[PDB]
Amino acid sequence: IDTEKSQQALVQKRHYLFDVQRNNIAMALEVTYRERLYRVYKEVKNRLDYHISV
Amino acid sequence: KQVAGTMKLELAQYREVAAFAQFGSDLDAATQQLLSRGVRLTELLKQGQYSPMAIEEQVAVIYAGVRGYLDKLEPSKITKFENAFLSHVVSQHQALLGTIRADGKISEQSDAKLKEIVTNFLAGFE
Amino acid sequence: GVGKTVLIMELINNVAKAHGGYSVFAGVGERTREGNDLYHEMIESGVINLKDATSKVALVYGQMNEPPGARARVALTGLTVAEYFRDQEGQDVLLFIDNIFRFTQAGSEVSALLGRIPSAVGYQPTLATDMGTMQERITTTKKGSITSVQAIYVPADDLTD
Amino acid sequence: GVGKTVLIMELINNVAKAHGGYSVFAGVGERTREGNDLYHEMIESGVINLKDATSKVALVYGQMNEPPGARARVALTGLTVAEYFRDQEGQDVLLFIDNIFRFTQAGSEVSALLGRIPSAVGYQPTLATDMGTMQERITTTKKGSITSVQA
C-alpha cells in the first residue's frame, strides 16, 4: 500500500522537470539580451574613447 | 582561530609521519587516516593566482575540509569540490556568510547551518 | 611559547620576597614590540607598579634599531644599576640580560666600524676580553652579590660557535 | 652532444622569415674553436651568405684569450648592435649570449684588477654598474623587442 502511496507523491513531484527547463529558457534569453546590450554599449564607448584619446 | 587550531594540529600530525607514505597500505589504520586527512588538507591549501578569498569563505572551506567530510573523497577531486562547493555557498547562503563576517565566530547556530550545507552539497556533489 | 617571561617575572618576585633584593632587566637588542609586551606584562603581574613606590625591577632598554654602540653599552648600563644595588645597598640582585648574543653582535659591529681586523668566524678580535670585562662584574662580594640570568641564543644551533 | 646550434640557427631563420626581424649572436668570452665551428655551420646552413646581403645574423665575438675588459664589454657590443635594429626598424630581434657565466667571471676579473670591490662580491645582476644595466636594455620597448637567449 504505502509503496504505491510513495509512488503517488513521487510522480506528483514530476512537474519540477519542466519548470527547470523553463528557468534555463528565460535565463539564457535575458543573458543573450543583456550581453547584446553590453556589446553595443562597449563598442560605442570604444569608438568614443578612441577619438577623444587620439 | 576555531578552525585553524585543529587544522594546524592535524597538519603537524601528518607531517610527523608523511615519510611513511608509499607504504601506507602496510601500516596502522589510524595513522593511515592521519595520512589521508593530511593529503586532503594540503590539497585544500592550494590556491590559484590573483584570487584572494574572503575570510568567511576561507573558514567555510577549511571547516568543510577539517571535519572529515573529504575523508571519503579522493584527493584528485578536492580542488574541483573546493571550487564548486564554494560557489554554492556564496550563491544560496549569502546570509550565513554575512552573519559569520559580522560576528567573526562559528556560533553553534552557524555551526549547525554549516553541517547542513556541507552535508547537502557533499550528497549532491559528484 | 614556553613561558620564559613568566619564569623571569617569577624569579624577580621570589628573589624580592625571600632575599629582599631587587632585579634589573637589560634588554640588549630587543624588538621594540617585544619590549613593550614585556613592559605591560610586568605592569600587570605586579612586578612593576606605576602607582606606588613598591616596584621590584628596574628596566634598561637598548633596542634593535639603535647604533651598535648603544646596543653594546646597554648591558653595562644595566650592570651599573645592579652594581649600585649590590654595593651601596648590600643585596642579592638579579640581572636579566636578554639577549646576550645580541651583546656579542653589537660588540662585533662596533669593532668592524672602527676598522679592526676581524677575528675567526667574524667576531671582533677582542671578543673574549669584551665578554670578560662585562661578566667579571657579576659576582659576589663582601657586601652583596649579583646573580645574572642571560638568555642565550645559539647561532645556527652550533655550540662551538 | 644534443644538436643545439641547429636549434639556434633555426630560431634565427624562423624569426627572420615569419617576422621581419634579425638576430645578433654575442660570443662573450668563448672558445675560439666553438666560435669558428658555429660561424662555419651558420655559413653552410644559409643563415649567413658571404656573397649576398641577405644574411640573417650579425656576429660579435670576444674570445677567451682577450683581456677581461674585452670579454666584459663584448656583451654590450652585441646588445648595442641589436638595440639599433629594435629602436630603428621596430623589429623583434633575437640576441643570443653564449654565456652569462663567462660575462660575470670576466667581469669579476675586471673588478679584481682595479682592486676596489673584494673578490667575494662577484657580480650583482641588480647593480647599475654591473650586469644590471645590461639585462635591463633587453626589454619590450613600445618600438620593438629584444629577446635574449642565453646558452
Next chain:
Amino acid sequence: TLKDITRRLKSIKNIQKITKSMKMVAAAKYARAERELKPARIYGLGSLALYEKADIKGPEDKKKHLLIGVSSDRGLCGAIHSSIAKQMKSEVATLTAAGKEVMLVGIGDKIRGILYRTHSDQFLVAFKEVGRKPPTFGDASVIALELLNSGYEFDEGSIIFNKFRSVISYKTEEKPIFSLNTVASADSMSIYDDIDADVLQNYQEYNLANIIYYSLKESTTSEQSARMTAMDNASKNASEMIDKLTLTFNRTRQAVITKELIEIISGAAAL
C-alpha cells in the same frame, strides 16, 4: 668540504628515514604476525600432542635423514637466516659424523643461498616466494606434496625454525619428524586402535604438512620481530652518524667563513 659534507649527510639522512619506514612496516606486520600465531600455535601443538603422549623416540640405527630449514626470501632480518644456517650446519656435521646420509631442504631464498655453496650435493629441493605474504596452509600443503613426491624416503627428519618467544627474543628450535616405519614399529603405538599401515601413512603425511605449517607461522612472526629490532638499531646508528657529520659540518662552515673573511680583509688591506 661544505658541499660534499652536505652530500654525505643527505645520503645518510636518506637511508636513515628509509630504515625508519621499514621498521614501522615491520612492526605493522608483526601485528597480524602475533595474532595469527595463537590459533596456528594451538593447531600445530595439537598436531604434535600425539607424538608427545605416545612418546615415540625415532630410530637411532638408521641413516637416511632429512633436514628442513625454515627461513624467508627477505633480508635485513638480522640474525635469523644466520641462526638457521648455523644450526643446519652444526647438525649436518653431527649427523654426517655418524655416516648418516643427510639431505637438505630450504624454505626460503636466503637460507638456500647461504647453505648452497658449502652444501650443494646434500640438497634436494628449495622454495621461494616465502616472506612477502603471511604463510597459509596452502603453502605448507604444496611443500609437503613436493617433499613426498621427491623419490627420497627419509627414515627420519627434522625441521629447524625460529620459535618466536617475545618481541625481542626468539630461539632457534628443531622439531623431529618421524616416518611411517617409526610410528608403526613403535611398541607404544600398540595401544592405538584401528591402526594399519595405510591409516598411519595418511596420518603421517598430514602431520608432516601440519608441522611445516606450524614452523612457517612461527618463523614468520620471529622474522618480522627481528626485522623490526634490526631496523630500529640501524636507525639509531644512522642518527649517531648524522650527529658526527653535523659536528664536522659546523667545523667546516666556521672554517669557510673565516677563510673568506681573511681573503676580503687581505684584498682590502693591500691599498
Next chain:
Amino acid sequence: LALKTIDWVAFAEIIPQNQKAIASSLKSWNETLTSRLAALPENPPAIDWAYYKANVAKAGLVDDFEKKFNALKVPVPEDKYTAQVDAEEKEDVKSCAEWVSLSKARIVEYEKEMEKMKNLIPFDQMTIEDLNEAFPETKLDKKKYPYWPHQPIENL
C-alpha cells in the same frame, strides 16, 4: 523576471536512468547561467553627452553617434522554445494522471483484500476449506498429485 524556485534532490528523484547525464548537464547549465546573470547588471550605463559634447572636437561625430544609438533598437530575441515544453508537460501530466488513477484503483483493491483478511474466523472453528479459502497456497495440488496424500512425502 519570472523564475520558478526549485528543489534539486526532488529533481534527481524524477530522472529516468536512460537520460541522467543530459539532465545533469541541464542542471549544470542552470547554475552557470545563474552566475552569468549575476555577472552583469540589468542595463548598461548609458553614455552621457556633455562629457563628449565638450571634449570631442570632431564635427557631428558625437552627435550622430548618440543619435544612431538612440535610433538603435537591439533585437530582443523571442524564445519559440517555451510552448513546446509546455505541451510536453501537458502530455506528461495526462500520462501521470492516468497512471495515478489506475494505481489508486490497485490501492483500493489491496485495501479490500487486506480488509477481507482482517475479518477472519477464529482458527479453532475454521475448516480446512475455510483455511484454503483464506490462503489459496495451503490448497493441495489435486492435479500434480491426484492421490493421497496429494503432496510429496518428503514435505509431509
